[PDB]
Design an enzyme around this catalytic site. Structure first.
Site, mmCIF file in Angstrom:
data_model
loop_
_atom_site.group_PDB
_atom_site.id
_atom_site.type_symbol
_atom_site.label_atom_id
_atom_site.label_comp_id
_atom_site.label_asym_id
_atom_site.label_seq_id
_atom_site.Cartn_x
_atom_site.Cartn_y
_atom_site.Cartn_z
ATOM 1 N N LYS F 154 34.188 32.080 25.703
ATOM 2 C CA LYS F 154 33.562 31.256 26.010
ATOM 3 C C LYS F 154 32.541 31.343 26.626
ATOM 4 N N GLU F 180 37.861 30.610 39.072
ATOM 5 C CA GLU F 180 38.223 31.081 38.049
ATOM 6 C C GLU F 180 38.949 32.358 38.678
ATOM 7 N N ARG F 181 39.953 32.160 37.166
ATOM 8 C CA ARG F 181 40.939 33.004 37.709
ATOM 9 C C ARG F 181 39.961 34.522 38.562
#
EC number: 7.1.2.2
Lengths: 60, 66, 466, 54, 487, 467, 128
Positions: F154, F180-181
């Site tokens: 994605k 987010e990571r």
């Protein structure tokens, strides 16, 4: 022990014009494979024992 | 083994008195002896009831394939 | 010292102790009560008020009333002389064979035996029930948790096993009727008497009864399990013993916990749950074991709340299981008693390991076939298997036959079944499947496999059919 | 052959669709029940979360 | 002493509302009179909500609560290897103490972007499927997701055992220090587990952090974080550690409870919200560093056990949203026997290639693809019964491949072997045979190669890849082996 | 004013402000902070006590601890100096490339620009991604939701879009990797560096990176969104630029909000979502705009929780969206990449005028056929799959081709795929489908169509396949 | 009482569903949280406590009994329904009545399959 060695030969198997063994060779090779794997698996040796130090830590 | 001198002097002193006796290291006490014998049983189960003062030995065989 | 009822709201007795204020779990005995009206302290709420849980029921308690802390947890009579005896939670014989002459008492908190102390080498407890051993093999010392619907012979089964097993046994057994139908206990009583395993000129039955039936007030039911643990530890650790511990039903333990939770002013987890279901569980579970010092082979009735396993409670439970018994109502609906579903009923100790691969594999084929079948029934549900491959048809039928073959009469419940019990040693078990699997059998009727004993009996039956 | 077949297919369609019908029914319970279950759980969550907001 | 001591305002539930302690450090781990430790979570204006690490039948009110003056650190070292510890870093293996006399803060936050370097190493498990199809690298994070004792654990174990050969390597690229977080797992289980490792003695490079079933809830809670700090240690020492969080699921439960006991509200799925933060932050600490940090890694295998495959199970949903992929295990194949029981159609390593060896890439790309159709050919023109040879082959082959990846419970392996055997099927060489013989063959083939083509194995391992020559070496070898399998 | 930590209940820091208070939303700095603890004022609880929100971790803090109000809300570095910079919430050089020599600060409460400011017309932004434009024709300045649930390349796709677009325009960027990571931001990082679109030798890029990963105070993470907005608005109008605003992930924002909501005392309504869900979005989305003096073409990555959009949150989200990309995980499971949901991935702003009728119709016909095809599915699963009636087959196949043709290679996940990504500007596409529509390639069969850019490549692929 | 007084009394509890409900209502009004089926749990205690009081006594009690014919009214036969489970696990069998037959007329209409007396295994006339 220690034991020496001959490779598969499928040509051999079929032929045995001593009829009384014809089946046996097919089965007998597979018995072999049992040993073959089994031997390849294990080592020959454990270790040994430092008795001096173990005597230090065994009061008996 | 050893820390706080104010208690420790007496406390450690009593422990050594133990070692300085041979009717047991000052005594033993039934309670311990009972458990010892029990626990001694169990660990033999832990690693089998052979006696590892001696080692194993094996036997030998062969058959004909064809 | 003494405390005052400051509030009674149910069996949550709010006690203001001032005079002392012992720790939590100190048992209090209420003054002004003829009953040994134990409240076991639950919270020090502060204001030297504790929330206690009456284990017992209440009433007739004029508030302010004096409660004298008995100062310790439930201390309960212990010693081998408990075998036979049915004691209530508070350890008094409710076998009423007079009192018991204990040896000592015990606080009914017993703890987790040590990680380092465990001997943990699972070995099948065989059962002789094909279905069981094979599918849900039991291990000696194992904790088997019997999920099962109400009345499905769940109880029956456990009993049935008890006979089969507890007899053979050399260690003792404990039956804990936790929250159980007194009636069932009555019944139970009478078999036990009858059976003479509870031999009553023997407080040296192979089985000690502790009953804290359905009727008890919650606290009593809540705590009685802990008690039971304490006893069995006595026998194991102290008396060596492999205990078989029958619990009917740990669910009620759970139930009890949750029930109180509210009253324990808690935020009670989902469905009202006791969140301390978890802690409870751990704290119990760890008491449960099979030490170096023996076994508590733990037969844990687990009512499956609403038969939802998904239900956190069982969900948690699984972690603690080692052998899971799922009695499966669907199956039950298929009439079958045995009613298990072993794709559910699984045993950690079911392993190619622990119980042979033969078992496993013969099973894996079965598990498989069934698993596939399970997949199929639904498409089939529409389609039938009619335009769906014959090999499948065969196999399906076989799976089923195997199913049927698992159906096994109850010797105990010959009254119930009509059918006369069967018990099948392993080999014939193996054999059975291997054969059916061989399709060797298959030229045969499905129902031939029904309610059999060994395969022979199916054979016998085949003739009897055709 | 075909005649036989066509009636069998016809037949086949008969059973199935009945079969279908009952199953629908069964699900429909499961439905509502769960349906409510949601609500319930949720209501629970509300009540609880409304008795336990910051 | 004074002030930064407290009298237990109220106690119940191991939740000490504590009178006093006021100038306290946030999240200070405190100390009990009992000697139990507790953690100051809530500084409320008029109490301190302190979670008691231990349990409160053991205590009572007004009791002196003394600050420890420390926000949690846990002993750290690496003398954790060969050790089973509790969260506080104390033997529970009961093997005297641990040699990890450094302590290091758990609450230390995750590094930045910059101290990382992303993956490009593979990470290997010996599990063919794993290593292939959801090929993993190191410093990573990946979900083991599945239900109960599917050898639930096994998966980790065999992997760990597998790392043994790497730990028998002298690398630190594959020499992997293993960290096992046991959450909620009864001692017995754990015992077995320990034992398993012991037996495997992979334990020597291994910490097993164990918060069994027992443990008061924070304890299970804490453990991961603990493990985490401990793992960051290696990571910053360039060392590559693998931490397995098994499982936060149980933790969360506990935590919720903890919150609830904190009289905080049941959040979504009755679980409070920042249990997300909880784990998220926890999990952010797993990483592959860049070189400045020795390049080290903490590879994370969190485990989550779904309940009924529920992933919309909030926390799973979360975790998924964290995960760099997940290793989905399915029952069916399991019931079918088939272990792998995985649905790779539901298992992912998004990554794929950074996590690989060219060797593996060479067969696996194709295979994955092939399996994809193969699996697919169960659905178009099949829901279960039909025929045509072209495709039948694909099936046959597929079935084979299934076996070929089918790797029963207990199986640590080395990748080239895996490739070796895989190669045989990929390169279509046994298609013929029945599944039943595959395994047998595989084994057989293995001693054969092991022995003989140890040469070759040497090479393939060496090349990290199979050279065309090595391939050729295979071609005859395999053919011949097959032939030998007869001939 | 000065505050005292009066309560720290988790990272909810209730500060009793002593010398009065500061107004709502004031960023407060805790005195005794090694890393200034920005507190966001949330309620004046009264008693000169506010409930505040920690925007740092609350460890070690002495209760009572002294807080000095920053006298404003969160004010943040702003200036051109943010181009090619990684800023955190508080702007901080989390690029770790030293402080940003920003020339402006801004309170991160940016608000809704006026009705009148809004460019009433936009022009379809063409992405050249066939499917994209086709079904959801994007408008330059548009609010694009990328709904999509997890993992499905994605992010990869998104990035790729960035490649395709941000490069291609004088349009600037803000990328907010929120929640987010840290890892993915790292990865991502390297890509830009690599791409040279983060070119650092001239620090500038055209891009602000704003990161507020999943290890940060939710409120803070929540607020990193505002931060970016505030900045971008500055670039939008002031720098006049069409800034492209990547938000990953606005769901998590919402989420971040919800997690706190409870704690904020708000009863976080259904599905757990904050009861303020509406306001949170409303204000946010309404803060977002493409005005007349610039565009924020707003690309919002939207995780679809559980692929449930009926999940109130996405459901809300939808309202704000004007172009929706709903990526279909099922389709993803159908392996594709284009993995999208297509019959859901829309822009209400598709037109027979504006996209011209050709496009429009083609899409509508297509959409229709797919919808129709879907209907046919109903026969086939249990009743045949190279089998039943045939005209429908014709369509089936056609749909199927269309599907395959709809598939287009991934252009960086060539690393994974080995497929060189492709892109097809609009006409060749429209046409493309028209040919297929024209049923030309019927002699031709399916798999040739898979994963292509323009149709020739499929034709070519057919040839390769005839072996 | 009758039970203690040697009598075999028959109480027909008709039906507890409403009671439970009532109780639930009570609970909720008592602002006591529930769980299952929106009920709390000690409706189980309720039922248990109620039903244990049904029994067959020994001689000492005149042999008396209180035979309980509880009625639980299903609503759409939801065995599944917890409270029904409750009681079921309590009872010594159940008489499930199936509607259709009734509805067909078929007076009466029992779901025979479910109609079971588990503890029933011998408890009637040799004749029968």
């Amino acid at each position: 022990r220690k034991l020496a060695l001959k490779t598969i030969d499928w040509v051999a198997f079929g032929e045995i014009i001593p009829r009384n063994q014809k089946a046996v060779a097919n089965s007998l090779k597979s018995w072999n494979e049992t040993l073959t794997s089994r031997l390849a698996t294990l080592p020959e040796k454990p270790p040994a024992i430092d008795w001096a130090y173990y005597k230090a830590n065994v009061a008996k | 083994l050893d820390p706080v001198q104010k208690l420790f002097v007496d406390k450690i002193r009593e422990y050594r008195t133990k070692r300085q006796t041979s009717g047991g290291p000052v005594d033993a006490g039934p309670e311990y002896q009972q458990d010892l014998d029990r626990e001694l049983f169990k660990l033999k189960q832990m690693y089998g009831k052979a006696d590892m003062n001696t080692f194993p030995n094996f036997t030998f065989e062969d058959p004909k394939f064809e | 010292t003494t405390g005052r009822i400051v509030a009674v709201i149910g069996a949550v007795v709010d006690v203001q102790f001032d005079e002392g204020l012992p720790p939590i779990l100190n048992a209090l005995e209420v003054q002004g009560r003829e009953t040994r009206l134990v409240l076991e302290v639950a919270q020090h709420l502060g204001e030297s008020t504790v929330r206690t849980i009456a284990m017992d029921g209440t009433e007739g308690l004029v508030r302010g009333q004096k409660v004298l802390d008995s100062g310790a947890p439930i201390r309960i009579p212990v010693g081998p002389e408990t075998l036979g005896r049915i004691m209530n939670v508070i350890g008094e014989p409710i076998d009423e064979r007079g009192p018991i002459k204990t040896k000592q008492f015990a606080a009914i908190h017993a703890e987790a035996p040590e990680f380092v102390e465990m001997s943990v080498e699972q070995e099948i407890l065989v059962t002789g029930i094909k279905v069981v051993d094979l599918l849900a093999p039991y291990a000696k010392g194992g904790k088997i948790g019997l999920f099962g619907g109400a009345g499905v012979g769940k109880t029956v089964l456990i009993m049935e096993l008890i006979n089969n097993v507890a007899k053979a046994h050399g260690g003792y057994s404990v039956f804990a009727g936790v929250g159980e139908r007194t009636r069932e206990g009555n019944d139970l009583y009478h078999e036990m008497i009858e059976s003479g395993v509870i031999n009553l000129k023997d407080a040296t039955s192979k089985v000690a009864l502790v009953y804290g039936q359905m009727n008890e007030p919650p606290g009593a039911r809540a705590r009685v399990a802990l008690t039971g643990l304490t006893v069995a530890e006595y026998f194991r650790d102290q008396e060596g013993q492999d205990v078989l511990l029958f619990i009917d039903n740990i669910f009620r333990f759970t139930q009890a916990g949750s029930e109180v939770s509210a009253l324990l002013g808690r935020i009670p987890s989902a469905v009202g749950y006791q969140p301390t279901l978890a802690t409870d569980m751990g704290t119990m579970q760890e008491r449960i074991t099979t030490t170096k010092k023996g076994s508590i082979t733990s037969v844990q009735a687990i009512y499956v709340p609403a038969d939802d396993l998904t239900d956190p409670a069982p969900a948690t439970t699984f972690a603690h299981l080692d052998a899971t018994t799922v009695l499966s109502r669907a199956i039950a609906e298929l009439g079958i008693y045995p009613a298990v579903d072993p794709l559910d009923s699984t045993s950690r100790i079911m392993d190619p390991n622990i119980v042979g691969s033969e078992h496993y594999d013969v099973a894996r084929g079965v598990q498989k076939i069934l698993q596939d079948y399970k997949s199929l029934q639904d498409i089939i549900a529409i389609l039938g298997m009619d335009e769906l491959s014959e090999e499948d048809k065969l196999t399906v039928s076989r799976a089923r036959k195997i199913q049927r073959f698992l159906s096994q009469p109850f010797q105990v419940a010959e009254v119930f079944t009509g059918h006369l019990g069967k018990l099948v040693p392993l080999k014939e078990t193996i054999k059975g499947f291997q054969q059916i699997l061989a399709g060797e059998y298959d030229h045969l009727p499905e129902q031939a496999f029904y309610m059999v004993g060994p395969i022979e009996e199916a054979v016998a039956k085949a003739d009897k059919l055709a | 052959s075909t005649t036989s077949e066509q009636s069998a297919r016809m037949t086949a369609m008969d059973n199935a669709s009945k079969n279908a019908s009952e199953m629908i029914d069964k699900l429909t319970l499961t439905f509502n029940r769960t349906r409510q279950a949601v609500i319930t759980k949720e209501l629970i969550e509300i009540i609880s979360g409304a008795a336990a907001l910051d | 002493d004074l002030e930064e001591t407290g009298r237990v305002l109220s106690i119940g539930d191991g939740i000490a509302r504590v009178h006093g302690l006021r100038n306290v450090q946030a999240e200070e781990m405190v100390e009990f009179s009992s000697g139990l430790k507790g953690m100051s979570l809530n500084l409320e204006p008029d109490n301190v909500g302190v979670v008691v690490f231990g349990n409160d039948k053991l205590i009572k009110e007004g009791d002196i609560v003394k600050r420890t003056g420390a926000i949690v650190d846990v002993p750290v070292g690496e003398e954790l290897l060969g050790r089973v510890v509790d969260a506080l870093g104390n033997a529970i293996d009961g093997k005297g103490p641990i040699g990890s006399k450094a302590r290091r803060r758990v609450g230390l936050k995750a590094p930045g972007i910059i101290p990382r370097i992303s993956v490009r190493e593979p990470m290997q498990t010996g599990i063919k499927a794993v290593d292939s199809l959801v090929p993993i690298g190191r410093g990573q994070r990946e979900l083991i997701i599945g239900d109960r004792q599917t050898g639930k654990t096994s998966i980790a174990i065999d992997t760990i055992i597998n790392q043994k050969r790497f730990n028998d390597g002298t690398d630190e690229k594959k020499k992997l220090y293993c960290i096992y977080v046991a959450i909620g797992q009864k001692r017995s289980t754990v015992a077995q587990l320990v034992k398993r490792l012991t037996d495997a003695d992979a334990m020597k490079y291994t910490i097993v952090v164990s918060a069994t079933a027992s443990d008061a809830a924070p304890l299970q809670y804490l453990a991961p974080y603990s493990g985490c700090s401990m793992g960051e240690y290696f990571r910053d020492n360039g060392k590559h550690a693998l931490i397995i969080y098994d499982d936060l699921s149980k933790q969360a439960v506990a935590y919720r409870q903890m919150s609830l006991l904190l009289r905080r509200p049941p959040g979504r799925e009755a679980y409070p919200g920042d249990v997300f933060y909880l784990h998220s932050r926890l999990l952010e600490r797993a990483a592959k560093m860049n070189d400045a940090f020795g390049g080290g890694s903490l590879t994370a295998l969190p485990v989550i056990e779904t309940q009924a495959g529920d992933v919309s199970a909030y926390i799973p949903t979360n975790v998924i949203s964290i995960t760099d992929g997940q290793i989905f295990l399915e029952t069916e194949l399991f019931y079918k026997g088939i272990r792998p029981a995985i649905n790779v159609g539901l298992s992912v390593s998004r990554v794929g290639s950074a996590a690989q060896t060219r060797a593996m890439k060479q067969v696996a790309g194709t295979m994955k693809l092939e399996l994809a159709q193969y699996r697919e050919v169960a659905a178009f023109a099949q829901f279960g019964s039909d025929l045509d040879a072209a495709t039948q082959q694909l099936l046959s082959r597929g079935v084979r491949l299934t076996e070929l990846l089918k790797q029963g419970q207990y199986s640590p392996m080395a990748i080239e072997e895996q490739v070796a055997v895989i190669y045989a099927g990929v390169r279509g060489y046994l298609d013929k045979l029945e599944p039943s013989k595959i395994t047998k063959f595989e084994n057989a083939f293995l001693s054969h190669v092991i022995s003989q083509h140890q040469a070759l194995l040497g090479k393939i391992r060496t090349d990290g890849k199979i050279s065309e020559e090595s391939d050729a070496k295979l071609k005859e070898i395999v053919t011949n082996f097959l032939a030998g399998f007869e001939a």
